[PDB]
Scaffold this active site. Sequence first.
Site, short mmCIF file in Angstrom:
data_model
loop_
_atom_site.label_atom_id
_atom_site.label_comp_id
_atom_site.label_asym_id
_atom_site.label_seq_id
_atom_site.Cartn_x
_atom_site.Cartn_y
_atom_site.Cartn_z
CE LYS A 190 -2.70 -1.72 3.42
NZ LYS A 190 -2.56 -3.05 3.46
CB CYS A 226 -8.47 -23.41 -5.80
SG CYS A 226 -7.51 -23.91 -4.42
N1 LIG Z 1 5.41 -3.46 -6.82
C1 LIG Z 1 5.97 -4.36 -6.09
N2 LIG Z 1 6.88 -5.38 -6.32
C2 LIG Z 1 7.61 -5.94 -5.50
N3 LIG Z 1 7.44 -5.57 -4.07
C3 LIG Z 1 6.79 -4.52 -3.57
C4 LIG Z 1 5.78 -4.10 -4.51
N4 LIG Z 1 5.26 -3.04 -3.87
C5 LIG Z 1 5.44 -3.16 -2.59
N5 LIG Z 1 6.62 -4.00 -2.29
C6 LIG Z 1 7.05 -4.53 -0.93
O1 LIG Z 1 5.91 -4.99 -0.31
C7 LIG Z 1 6.41 -5.10 0.86
C8 LIG Z 1 5.27 -4.38 1.78
O2 LIG Z 1 4.75 -3.19 1.44
P1 LIG Z 1 3.78 -2.45 2.26
O3 LIG Z 1 3.64 -1.01 1.52
O4 LIG Z 1 4.93 -2.36 3.51
O5 LIG Z 1 2.76 -3.11 2.50
P2 LIG Z 1 1.39 -2.75 3.34
O6 LIG Z 1 1.34 -1.20 3.88
O7 LIG Z 1 0.32 -2.93 2.00
O8 LIG Z 1 1.40 -3.73 4.45
C9 LIG Z 1 7.67 -4.04 0.88
O9 LIG Z 1 8.79 -4.98 1.30
C10 LIG Z 1 7.59 -3.28 -0.15
O10 LIG Z 1 8.82 -2.66 -0.48
MG LIG Z 2 1.27 -0.29 5.48
ZN LIG Z 3 -8.93 -25.03 -3.29
#
Ligand SMILES: Nc1ncnc2c1ncn2[C@@H]1O[C@H](COP(=O)(O)OP(=O)(O)O)[C@@H](O)[C@H]1O
Ligand SMILES: [Mg+2]
Ligand SMILES: [Zn+2]
Length: 527
Positions: free
Chosen positions: A57, A406
Site C-alpha cells: 500500500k 483455486c
Molecule cells: N510492486 C512491487 N513489487 C515488489 N515488491 C513490492 C511492490 N510494492 C511493494 N512491495 C514490497 O512489499 C512489501 C510490503 O509493502 P507495504 O507497502 O509495506 O505493505 P502494506 O502497507 O500493504 O502492508 C515491502 O517490502 C515493499 O517494498
Molecule cells: Mg502499510
Molecule cells: Zn482449493
Amino acid sequence: SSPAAWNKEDFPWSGKVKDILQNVFKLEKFRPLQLETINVTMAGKEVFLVMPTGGGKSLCYQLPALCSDGFTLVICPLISLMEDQLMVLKQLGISATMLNASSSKEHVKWVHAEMVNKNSELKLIYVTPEKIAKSKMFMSRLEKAYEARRFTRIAVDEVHCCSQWGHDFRPDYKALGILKRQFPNASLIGLTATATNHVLTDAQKILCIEKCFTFTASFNRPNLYYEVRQKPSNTEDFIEDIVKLINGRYKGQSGIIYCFSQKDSEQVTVSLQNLGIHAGAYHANLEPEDKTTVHRKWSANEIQVVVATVAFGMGIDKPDVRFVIHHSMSKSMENYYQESGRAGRDDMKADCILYYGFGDIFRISSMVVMENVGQQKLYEMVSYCQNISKCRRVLMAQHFDEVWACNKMCDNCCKDSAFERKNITEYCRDLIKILKQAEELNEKLTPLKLIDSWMGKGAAKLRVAGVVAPTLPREDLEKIIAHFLIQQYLKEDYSFTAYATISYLKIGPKANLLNNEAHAITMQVTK
Ligand SMILES: Nc1ncnc2c1ncn2[C@@H]1O[C@H](COP(=O)(O)OP(=O)(O)O)[C@@H](O)[C@H]1O
Ligand SMILES: [Mg+2]
Ligand SMILES: [Zn+2]
Ligand SMILES: [Cl-]
Ligand SMILES: [Cl-]
Ligand SMILES: [Cl-]
Ligand SMILES: [Cl-]
C-alpha cells in the site's frame, strides 16, 4: 469509473512513474491495483485502497510524493509503523521525516522550516493524528505550505481507524476531517487492509470526502498452498513430523512456525535445535537485543525457521518464506489469513499448513474469554479446520465477503474422495446424558473428563450405564465433540481461578432441539 479505466501508462506522469519505480524503488513491476491507485492520486483525485497487509500500500503514496512538488503528509497511528517506513526510504535515498511526541526542539524547528522552504527536497512527512488535533503550530505551517503550493497530498495510513465500527479506532482520527475542509486542493489517499463497506463509508464521512474512488485488491494469494493436518497427541511425534517437512520438502528453505504461547515457542525451538534444525525463538518477553538477532539471522538465512508467537508479524516483509506452519490454530480466520499470508511474498509457490488439535480449542477459548466475539471467532476457525470437502479459498472468501479458481492449491481441492452425511445424533444424546448426570452430581466436566466418560474410562461416578463410545480413533471422537461445541448443542463454561481461566462443557443452548425425537445431527464424512 472502475480500476480498469486507470490501468494505463498513458498519462503525462507515466514515463516518470515507471522510471522512479525501477530506478529509485528498485522494483520492476506494479502489483495488482498499485498502478491504478497511483494514477488516481497523480490525477489529484480521492481514493481508498483496500489491500491485504504486506501487499504494497505504501508505494501508492510514496511514489507520487516523488513525482510531485513539495511534500506528502502521511498520517500514521503508531510511531513503529512510521519508523518502519522511514528506514526503508533512507536506504532508498529518499528525503522523508517524521514529527512525534518525543521529537526534538531542534528537529521540530527544522521540519517547520522545510515545509515552507521553496527549495526543499523533503518529500514525505509522517505524523500521528495527535499532531493534527493538538498542534496549533503545525497546522499553521501546513496552511502556509498549502498556500505556497508545497502541500499537495495527504496520505492517511490505516484509514479504517476513522470509523465507529473499526476495531482499531482512535479518537484523534475523528479530527482528521479538518484536512479536506482546510486543504481541499490537497488530494487524499486512504489505505487499509481491514475494510468493511460501512467502515469505509463511515471513514469517508469522518474525513469529509465525497466523491471518492474505492479500489479493493482480492485477498486471494494464488501461490499459497493451504492445508490442515491432524495435530498429534504426542508432542515428540509432532516434532518428528515437523523436522521431516523441514529436512524434506523445505530443505534449505525459509519459513515460520507460529505458536499459541511463549512457552510453546521456547519449547519447540529447543526441540528442533536438538534435532539439527537452525531454529530461533521469537516472543514478546525476549530481550529486544535478541528480537533483532533472531530477525537479522532469519532474514539473512542463517536461521531457517523462526518459532514465534503472533508478536512476530508487524513489519515482516521477507519475500522468500516458503512455509508457514501453524503449530496451533489461530484465534480467528482473520488472524489465520494474515499469519499464513506472510508466506510466499515473492509470489512463488509456498505452503500454509495448519495443525488442528482438540485441546487447542480450549486453550484459546479460555484465553479470549474477555473479548466480545472472541469465542465466536475461534469457532469459525474450528469450523475451517473441521472441513474436509470445501475448498480452503472458498471458506476464506466466505469470511472476507468477496465475490470469488483455486487450481488444486489446497488440500481439499486435491482430494479425489467422495463424502456423505453421517447421522451422529445419538452420540450427542449420549454425551448430554453424561453432562446431565454430572450436574445432578454437582460435578464439573473438563472436555477430557467428558471424553473419558464417553469412552468408559475416568472416574466411575462420571459414567452413565449403557453409554458406549464408538471404536473410532480419539481424534474422531474429539471432532464429533468439537462439532457439537461449535453447533452449540454443547457449550463451554469458564471458571476463573487464582492464576488461570479453565473451560468445562455443559449442555448448550441448542440441546432443546433434541426434544424433537426426530431431530438429526449430521457431520460430513468420507465415503
Ligand atoms: N510492486 C512491487 N513489487 C515488489 N515488491 C513490492 C511492490 N510494492 C511493494 N512491495 C514490497 O512489499 C512489501 C510490503 O509493502 P507495504 O507497502 O509495506 O505493505 P502494506 O502497507 O500493504 O502492508 C515491502 O517490502 C515493499 O517494498
Ligand atoms: Mg502499510
Ligand atoms: Zn482449493
Ligand atoms: Cl490482511
Ligand atoms: Cl522481514
Ligand atoms: Cl455429503
Ligand atoms: Cl459437517
